[PDB]
Design an enzyme around this catalytic site. Structure first.
Site, PDB file in Angstrom:
ATOM      1  CD  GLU A 180      11.367  73.612  51.389  1.00 22.61           C
ATOM      2  OE1 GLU A 180      10.688  72.566  51.365  1.00 22.61           O
ATOM      3  OE2 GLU A 180      12.328  73.812  50.620  1.00 22.61           O
ATOM      4  CG  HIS A 181      13.855  78.227  54.826  1.00 19.51           C
ATOM      5  ND1 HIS A 181      15.167  78.421  55.199  1.00 19.51           N
ATOM      6  CD2 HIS A 181      13.894  77.619  53.618  1.00 19.51           C
ATOM      7  CE1 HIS A 181      15.965  77.943  54.261  1.00 19.51           C
ATOM      8  NE2 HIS A 181      15.218  77.451  53.292  1.00 19.51           N
ATOM      9  CD  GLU A 240      21.176  78.806  51.955  1.00 21.22           C
ATOM     10  OE1 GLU A 240      21.721  77.871  52.579  1.00 21.22           O
ATOM     11  OE2 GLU A 240      19.982  78.778  51.590  1.00 21.22           O
ATOM     12  CG  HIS A 259      13.217  77.431  48.885  1.00 21.78           C
ATOM     13  ND1 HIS A 259      13.471  76.087  49.060  1.00 21.78           N
ATOM     14  CD2 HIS A 259      14.283  78.086  49.400  1.00 21.78           C
ATOM     15  CE1 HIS A 259      14.647  75.938  49.641  1.00 21.78           C
ATOM     16  NE2 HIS A 259      15.160  77.135  49.857  1.00 21.78           N
TER      17      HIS A 259
END
Ligand code: CDL
Ligand code: CDL
Ligand code: CDL
Ligand code: PC7
Ligand code: 3PH
Ligand code: 3PH
Ligand code: HEM
Ligand code: HEM
Ligand code: UQ5
Ligand code: ZN
Lengths: 70, 50, 59, 48, 55, 108, 441, 50, 122, 464
Positions: free
Chosen positions: J75-76, J152, J72
């Site tokens: 993709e940042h 977040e 994950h």
């Protein structure tokens, strides 16, 4: 309790600003006649069926007792 | 009237006419309870709101 | 660890209308075995004192 | 209006009636009450 | 309308009529609705002529 | 409210004091309360009767006679319990005939 | 037992290629249009897709509303595809759900659209269901009364986005007439709504010359031959309140808006009727795209802005091209200054790379709008209703044949025309309105 | 819908917030009264036979 | 038996008219209509059809019901000037109830139940 | 009866033959490179747009406890600059081809794709290979994304449905790789670096695990040439480190369990109940698709929910048990999940739970033929709707080559769907649902949700 949509105006009078038992003596024959007019047919039907069938059965019972009579 | 007739007949003796009348009363009691109440009631509903 | 078999599950356990008669026959045989064990123990312990022992003795 | 009123109005179709499988699963309870009564009374070898 | 005020006295009127009929039956005609044969002690070897229940 | 603090008073208030009833009920809606009164009367008279009745053959008839002639107010109790069954059945039969006449058993 | 052949293995000899491969058509299919003897125009385009889309476009929307029938288009979006003269609501729902088809009702600012999407094997069923639900709709009292609640939460949810409110107030300020009416009205506007109001609105908007049947992936001769007895319509054309651009400025007061929104707009001359002006307006919209999210998780930082959202609407005879930008509550004058600077720098000239990039963005949007069958059917229907023809090839040619000098001339002519200015939020910092509309003069 | 507007949690790296954002697959139960079987143990339970 | 059934159709109409005339003469002494006899507690189709009516009609029906119940409590009838205006065969519920019953018949032929239940007060 | 408005259409559900739709559906061509990478195209004859990308048989399942969250985080990082193109160079070149790049990272699948026009196929291939092979993975960008992810995470910034489904995967797949979240824990993000990203991409992004799938307007031979030029340098895979060996080494385990995430002042009550379903290669996965269509889904913005074909949708819409719900059928390489997810509040949560359990157990006993025919028609129509968008065509090509090993033809799929009848539905429901353990997950206002014994009791009926 339910919510009944209704548009009216209700008036009620105190029990102590009225007579209690003095229109019964005036309305008594009209109540009697109205009761017998409203329920006349059913009471007559019940009475005719009950008493006619009972009378027929009693007459036939007497006849059957007389038929075996020496 | 049928039920009151059956009440009167129960206090009598067994006789062929009373046997016949009691049989007819029992037949009419079943006829009213099982035929008149559904079918005549449905006819009344069809007459009033049909 | 120990686990009920699938083929034995599909026969006697999946429907209540099959489970209940099996339950009743197992109940019958369990009552018979308990009756047998209790009666055998009682008759063995009290041998020679019962009425049937005297009657069979008098034969 | 539950009962004969449902069938007079046409609410009991071939659909909304129980299936054959449903009636068989309900009909399988007939053996359970027979076996339970025979278990309770135990009339052994009483079949004629 | 409320039960406890309006239908208490209305039930009391009918209860008083029933008490009048009950008092008449108890004190004046106590054996009217019965059967005279039930005042005989029971005999299993002799039967009465007519065997009928209560009304 | 005083009836809002004890749960016994709340149920009694809700079902015997403030219960909403149609205002045009006639005197053929008094069958049920009369039947309940007759049931209570039969229970009371019978519980009083059972203190002088012996439930054995060769004593039952004599115990009823001793109840009738020797127990104070015993004749009233016996005749009340005997005729109360008749009045109980009169009231319950008229109740059933009311329900038959009006279709009172229908939905709901 | 069922099938036990695993999906990595091919299915057995009961798996036949009995349908042969049909040969492809020689050329790309063209749009074929005609008119029924009742006056309804029918246009269709054939596709190789296995999905047929049928949409019915009726002139109306917020532009045909009155103060009495206010918010009737939003109610018609919910109340459509219910009980008709021939079918109940239950029967129509089951007939849509039997063939796996989907229905929509969509109200614009100058039209309402009703559509059914299905597979190519059920196009007659879709056409019959759509025609019956549009023409013979009943609009019963109890169904509209029960749908009004869901209408109220849908409008209340759609007004939560500040861009919708800014768009409403911008259309109010820019136009006088039909196009200035509010589409997304307040929920309390439809509080006294009844089915008579909706029936009155429907009777006003419905006329044979204001209805277009558009289809994708349907043969045209078959569609006209089977829709002639279904779309025989009667009625009178209720007068249309033609709109005019006047400009101006306004404000909105929002008590708990964490940001502050500023809208700036101009008039696109000619509306949807002119191909070249609409193409130039789309190029200007792409040139105003500052932060386009072309990649995941990319963080383009502006000094003042929080969001930039341009637009280019092309109505009949007139349009509205512009941009809406957000910002901090204390920096609203900076937002205004940056927006004026951006439009002025656009008027100062575009430099080759920007022109090619904006042309490619406009071409990509135009081609991705008509990629699917429902999108292509909607585009054909809207273009035929607004103009009388579908000209996507001509729009692409106009987009590709645009020079930088033409775009600079277009923006120069735009900034001379009086603009439209709308603010939003708990406005506690604002330059005075006279100096707001001075920087383009 | 977002969890900040619907569940409205407190902000911070509290023990409940850590499992809310990323739950762990290594759940530990209390084993003072009952010891667990190995995870993923298949088959119809032996308790029916008992 | 269809030929005898065709003869029985004007007979059915005659008995229906005679019954309706007699009951409506009995109905008009209380101000009631024929549609006022239908009870939502007794019939769920009536309970659903009454939910589909505009509120003024429900107010008028409730007023007529309260007037009739007051008259029954008083053991009285309407005055003659008021009794001459009564129209017991005017329909306000018949089309709504007919469409509800047709909907319930159409759902039952496909296996679906009615989307409304009985009324429960507990 | 209207003559023209009442022909052709009726509410009686009958089976539809979708065979004539197969005559014009396009064909898929697959070419395997010597690298082991498959190149698969599907040319739509008059398409103007193209979706193309790289699908990888990897994700959060194949990580470890130490680097959970690397896929994950990739993709940042991956779109923040390569070794041949900067951030602005990539942005300008993507803007000039008029498309957008996008990425998804699942538990077992990853895709990076581009939706461009037909003239920009080679440029999109070159750009995708440039991010995939020659990325910078700069430490400054890693530090610039770590703090945003940590904010977040501290705010609990998550969708409610994703929160519930992550709890569901964590409690149903305890002590197996499928129980980890895609996002990963807070500590791995707080201690992430460039070395772990390099090692993950070196280990897992190899030839036999990668499909280049393109749909729309694309030539197969030209894409073969472009892929051999660009993606020809990817490493091959060792036989000992294949996907099947990793699946055998760490298998999935299903445990019947219960979790709720209680909040003190929440409004909604989201809940999901799932049973152990089928893997992708199980032939019972097609009846599970039909059963999921039979259960359906509903949200309260629709007003025709009371006229639904589905009995669960009818019950929930008529009684107002939930604001929204949906039935799901999740398939993995060696296991799956089948169940219903819904949103309600605390006063309607038990009745919604009862409706879910009663409608799930009912499919084992009574299934009528009209519902099965309706669901088969709806599922085939849903499959035809995916053929309309080239993005879904490319996604299905990539997924089908990764997880089935082959491109299932449309005729075989229609034949496999048409072989499902009511007896098959009863058998599959008996296999998966009846008297089995389930997994229960809830979040929000969940004080009135029933416990595990209530849910376990209602997986069987004592009356039959
Ligand atoms: C046989 C006679 C009955 C014939 C019909 C008749 O007279 O109508 C009843 C009549 C009431 O007529 P109404 O005014 O139309 O009332 C209708 C209500 O339903 C009547 O009111 P209600 O039913 O709601 O209950 C009240 C009812 C309560 O009375 C009754 O329930 C009737 C019993 C009254 C006793 C009459 C004796 C004859 C039968 C025993 O009437 C009275 O209060 C009667 C007056 C009290 C008598 C004096 C008290 C001291 O009551 C009477 O008995 C008339 C009073 C004369 C007394 C006779 C001695
Ligand atoms: C000497 C005997 C004649 C008495 C004179 C009658 C003329 C006045 C009648 C009248 O209106 O009196 C007012 C009033 C009677 O009330 P109503 O509003 O006419 O309603 C009762 C009727 O039975 C109205 O009954 P309904 O309208 O409900 O008709 C249905 C009833 C038909 O009832 C009858 O036709 C009479 C029952 C025949 C057995 O069907 C039955 O046979 C069901 C059995 C119910 C027992 C009724 C007592 O008189 C009283 O206040 C009497 C008080 C009675 C208290 C004791 C109740 C239980 C013992
Ligand atoms: C052992 C044999 C029981 C048997 O044959 O069960 C069949 C029958 C069908 O049950 P099922 O369809 O397998 O499961 C219940 C449904 O899921 C529907 O369950 P539900 O979620 O709608 O709630 C029903 C619930 C609550 O049911 C009620 O409405 C209350 C039941 C009251 C019974 C307890 C009274 C105890 C003695 C006081 C007098 O019933 C229970 O708690 C289970 C059965 C109660 C015993 O179970 C019963 O309802 C038992 C009947 C009562 C006789 C024992
Ligand atoms: C008839 C009485 C109940 C018989 C027992 C019974 O039904 O068992 C209950 C539970 O049993 C009880 O609670 C009853 C125990 C006492 C039994 C007393 C029986 C009395 C019989 C008297 C003679 C008649 C439920 O289990 P079944 O559905 O039958 O078994 C399958 C269950 N499962 C699918 C989950 C594997
Ligand atoms: C008086 C008529 C009856 C009669 O002559 O009986 C003989 C009987 C006496 O017979 P005897 O000894 O021959 O004079 O009369 C009575 O005592 C009966 C009086 C009450 C009438 C019965 C009414 C209630 C019962 C019927 C309802 C039951 C069904 C409900 C459903
Ligand atoms: C049309 C066909 C039917 C379909 C609709 C109806 C339906 O689905 O049913 C739901 C229906 C209500 O649904 P609705 O009518 O659609 O609102 O519910 C009932 O069926 C209620 C029935 C009430 C009567 C119960 C009878 C109990 C019999 C045994 C009683 C035992 C003695 C108790 C007391 C003893 C003393 C202690
Ligand atoms: C000891 C026996 C009984 C008692 C104490 C009793 C009690 C009551 C009471 C207090 C009421 C309300 C007031 C009233 O309407 O009278 C009532 C109503 C009713 N009872 Fe009885 N009852 C008994 C026997 C019966 C029997 C034997 C039946 C039928 C076979 C029955 C059927 C009804 C019905 C249908 C109602 C409702 C009537 C209506 O509202 O229209 N009851 N009962
Ligand atoms: C707790 C309640 C009751 C008790 C303790 C009770 C007690 C008795 C006793 C001890 C006797 C025998 C003495 C005698 O006959 O004088 C008797 C007789 C009788 N009981 Fe009751 N009873 C009760 C309720 C009832 C009820 C509710 C009914 C009717 C429905 C009833 C009907 C009768 C009848 C008809 C007799 C025959 C009386 C006679 O002909 O002498 N009893 N009861
Ligand atoms: C249609 O409208 C209605 C009526 O019609 C107007 C009614 O009539 C009634 C019911 C009437 C009731 C409950 C009163 C009648 C009395 C009954 C049923 C019981 C009789 C009891 C009596 C007289 C006293 C009993 C005394 C004692 C001490 C026993 C209690 C024992 C202990 C505390 C240990 C109801 C509900 C009603 O809705
Ligand atoms: Zn993540």
């Amino acid at each position: 309790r339910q919510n009944i949509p209704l548009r009216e105006i209700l008036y009620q009078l105190s029990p102590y600003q009225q007579d209690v038992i003095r229109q019964t003596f005036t309305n008594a024959p009209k109540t009697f006649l109205r009761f017998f007019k409203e329920k006349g047919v059913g009471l007559a039907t019940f009475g005719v069926l009950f008493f006619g069938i009972k009378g027929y059965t009693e007459h036939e019972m007497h006849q059957e007792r007389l038929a075996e009579r020496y | 009237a049928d039920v009151l007739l059956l009440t009167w007949l129960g206090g009598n003796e067994i006789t062929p006419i009373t046997s016949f009348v009691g049989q007819c009363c029992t037949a009419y009691l079943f006829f009213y309870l099982l035929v008149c109440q559904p079918l005549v009631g449905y006819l009344e509903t069809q007459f009033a709101h049909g | 660890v120990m686990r009920l078999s699938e083929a034995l599950y599909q026969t006697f356990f999946k429907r209540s209308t099959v489970y209940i008669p099996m339950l009743l026959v197992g109940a019958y045989f369990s009552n018979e075995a308990i009756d047998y064990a209790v009666d055998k123990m009682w008759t063995t312990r009290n041998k020679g004192k019962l009425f049937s022992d005297i009657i069979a003795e008098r034969t | 209006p539950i009962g004969v009123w449902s069938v007079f109005q046409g609410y009991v179709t071939p659909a909304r009636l129980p299936s054959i499988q449903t009636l068989t699963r309900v009909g399988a309870w007939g053996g359970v009450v027979v076996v339970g009564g025979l278990y309770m009374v135990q009339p052994w070898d009483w079949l004629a | 309308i409320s039960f406890g005020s309006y239908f208490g006295a209305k039930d009391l009127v009918g209860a008083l009529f029933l008490a009048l009929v009950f008092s008449i039956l108890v004190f004046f005609y106590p054996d009217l609705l019965g059967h005279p044969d039930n005042l005989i002690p029971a005999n299993p070897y002799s039967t009465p002529q007519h065997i009928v229940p209560e009304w | 409210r005083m009836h809002n603090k004890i749960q016994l008073l709340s149920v009694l208030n809700t079902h015997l004091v403030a219960y909403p009833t149609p205002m045009n009920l006639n005197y053929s809606w008094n069958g049920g309360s009369l039947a309940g009164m007759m049931l209570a009367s039969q229970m009371l008279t019978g519980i009083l009767l059972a203190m002088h009745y012996v439930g054995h053959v060769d004593y039952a008839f004599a115990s009823v006679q001793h109840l009738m002639t020797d127990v104070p107010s015993g004749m009233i109790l016996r005749y009340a319990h005997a005729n109360g069954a008749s009045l109980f059945f009169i009231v319950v039969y008229l109740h059933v005939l009311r329900g038959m006449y009006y279709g009172s058993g229908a939905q709901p | 037992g069922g099938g036990r052949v695993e999906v990595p293995l091919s299915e057995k000899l009961p798996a036949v290629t009995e349908p042969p491969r049909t040969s492809t058509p020689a050329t790309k299919p063209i749009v074929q249009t005609s008119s029924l003897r009742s006056g309804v125009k029918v246009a269709s385009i054939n596709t190789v897709s296995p999905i047929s889309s049928l949409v019915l476009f009726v002139e109306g929307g917020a532009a045909a509303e009155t103060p009495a029938t206010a918010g009737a288009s939003k109610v018609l979006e919910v109340a459509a595809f219910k009980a008709t003269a021939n079918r109940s609501t239950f029967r129509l729902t089951r007939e849509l759900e039997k063939i796996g088809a989907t229905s929509f009702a969509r109200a614009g600012r100058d039209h309402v659209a009703f559509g059914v999407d299905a597979t190519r094997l059920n196009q007659l069923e879709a056409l019959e269901i759509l025609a019956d639900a549009v023409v013979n709709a009943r609009y019963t009292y109890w169904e509209v009364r029960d749908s009004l609640d869901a209408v109220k939460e849908q409008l209340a949810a759609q007004l939560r986005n500040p861009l919708t409110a800014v768009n409403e107030v911008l259309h109010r300020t820019a136009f006088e007439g039909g196009l200035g009416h509010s589409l997304v009205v307040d929920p309390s506007v439809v509080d006294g709504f009844t089915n008579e109001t909706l029936k009155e609105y429907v009777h006003s908007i419905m006329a044979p010359s204001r209805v277009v049947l558009a289809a994708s992936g349907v043969d045209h001769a078959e569609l006209t031959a089977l829709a002639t007895p279904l779309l025989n319509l009667h009625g009178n054309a209720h007068p249309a309140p033609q709109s005019r651009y006047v400009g101006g400025a306004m404000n909105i007061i929002a008590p708990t808006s964490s940001l502050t929104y500023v809208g700036l707009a101009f008039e696109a001359k000619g509306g949807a009727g002119d191909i070249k002006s609409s193409a130039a307006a789309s190029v200007v919209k792409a040139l105003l795209d500052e932060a386009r999210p072309t990649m995941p998780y990319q963080r383009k930082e502006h000094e003042v802005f929080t969001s930039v959202n341009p637009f280019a609407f092309a109505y009949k005879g007139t349009g509205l091209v512009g941009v809406v930008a957000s910002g901090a509550p204390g920096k609203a004058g900076k937002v205004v200054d940056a927006l004026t600077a951006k439009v002025q720098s656009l008027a100062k000239g575009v430099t080759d790379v920007q022109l090619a990039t904006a042309k490619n963005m406009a071409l990509g949007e135009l081609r991705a709008s008509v990629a699917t069958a429902p999108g292509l059917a909607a585009a054909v229907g809207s273009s035929v209703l607004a103009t009388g023809k579908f000209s996507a090839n001509e729009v692409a040619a106009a987009l590709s044949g645009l020079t930088a000098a033409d775009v600079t001339s277009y923006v120069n002519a735009m900034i001379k025309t009086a603009p439209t200015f709308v603010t939003y939020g708990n406005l506690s910092s604002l330059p005075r309105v006279d100096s707001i509309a001075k920087r383009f003069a | 819908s977002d969890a900040v507007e619907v569940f409205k949690p407190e902000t911070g790296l509290t023990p409940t917030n850590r499992l809310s954002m990323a739950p762990t697959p290594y759940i530990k139960y209390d084993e003072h009264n009952h010891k667990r079987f190995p995870p993923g143990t298949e088959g119809r339970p032996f308790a029916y036979f008992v | 038996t269809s030929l005898l059934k065709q003869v029985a159709l004007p007979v059915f109409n005659s008995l229906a008219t005679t019954y309706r005339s007699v009951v409506g003469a009995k109905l008009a002494k209380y101000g009631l209509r024929f549609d006022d006899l239908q009870d939502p507690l007794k019939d769920e189709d009536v309970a659903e059809a009454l939910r589909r009516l505009p509120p003024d009609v429900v107010v008028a029906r409730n007023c007529r019901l309260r007037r009739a119940l007051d008259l029954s409590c008083k053991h009285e009838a309407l005055p003659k000037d008021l009794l001459e205006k009564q129209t017991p065969e005017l329909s306000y519920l018949q089309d709504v109830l007919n469409e509800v019953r047709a909907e319930r018949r159409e759902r039952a032929q496909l296996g679906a139940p009615a989307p409304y239940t009985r009324i429960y007060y507990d | 009866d209207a003559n023209p408005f009442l022909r052709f259409s009726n509410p009686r559900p009958s089976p539809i033959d979708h065979t004539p739709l197969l005559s014009t559906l396009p064909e898929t061509r697959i070419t395997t490179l010597p690298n082991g990478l498959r190149v698969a195209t599907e040319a739509i004859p008059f398409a103007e747009t193209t979706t193309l990308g790289i699908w990888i048989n990897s994700g959060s399942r194949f990580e470890t406890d130490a680097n959970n969250g690397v896929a994950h985080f990739l993709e940042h990082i991956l779109f923040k600059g390569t070794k041949n193109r900067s951030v602005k160079e990539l942005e300008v070149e993507v803007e000039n081809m008029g498309g957008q790049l996008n990425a998804y990272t699942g538990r077992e699948q990853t895709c990076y794709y581009a939706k461009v026009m037909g003239k920009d196929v080679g440029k999109a291939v070159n750009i995708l290979s440039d991010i995939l092979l020659n990325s910078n993975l700069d430490a400054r960008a890693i530090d610039k994304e770590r703090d945003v992810i940590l904010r977040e995470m501290e705010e609990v910034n998550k969708q409610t449905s994703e929160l519930v489904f992550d709890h569901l995967h964590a409690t149903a797949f305890q002590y197996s790789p499928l129980g980890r979240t895609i996002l990963g824990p807070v500590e791995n993000i707080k201690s992430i670096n460039r070395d772990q990203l390099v090692e993950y991409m070196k280990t897992h992004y190899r030839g036999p695990r990668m499909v280049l799938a393109a749909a729309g307007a694309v030539n197969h031979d030209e894409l073969v040439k472009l892929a051999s030029d660009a993606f020809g340098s990817v490493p091959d895979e060792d036989a000992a480190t294949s996907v099947r060996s990793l699946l055998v080494k760490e298998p999935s385990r299903f445990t019947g369990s219960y979790v709720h995430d209680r909040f003190p002042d929440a409004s909604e009550c989201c809940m999901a109940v799932a049973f152990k379903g089928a893997s992708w290669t199980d032939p019972d996965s097609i009846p599970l698709m039909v059963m999921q269509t039979m259960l359906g889904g509903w949200d309260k913005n629709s007003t025709v929910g009371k006229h639904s074909s589905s009995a669960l949708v009818q019950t929930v819409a008529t009684e107002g048990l939930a604001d929204a719900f949906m039935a799901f059928n999740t398939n993995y390489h060696d296991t799956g999940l089948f169940g219903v997810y819904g949103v309600t509040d605390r006063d309607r949560s038990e009745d919604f739970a009862y409706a879910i359990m009663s409608n799930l157990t009912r499919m084992c006993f009574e299934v009528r033929d009209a519902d099965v025919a309706r669901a088969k028609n709806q599922l085939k129509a849903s499959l035809m709707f995916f053929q309309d968008s080239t993005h879904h065509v490319a996604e299905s090509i990539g997924r089908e080559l990764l997880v089935y090993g082959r491109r299932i033809p449309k005729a075989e799929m229609f034949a496999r769907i048409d072989a499902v009848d009511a007896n098959a539905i009863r058998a599959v429901a008996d296999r998966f649902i009846y008297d089995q353990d389930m997994a229960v997950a809830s979040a929000g206002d969940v004080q009135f949700v029933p416990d595990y014994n209530w849910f376990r009791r209602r997986s069987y009926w004592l009356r039959y």
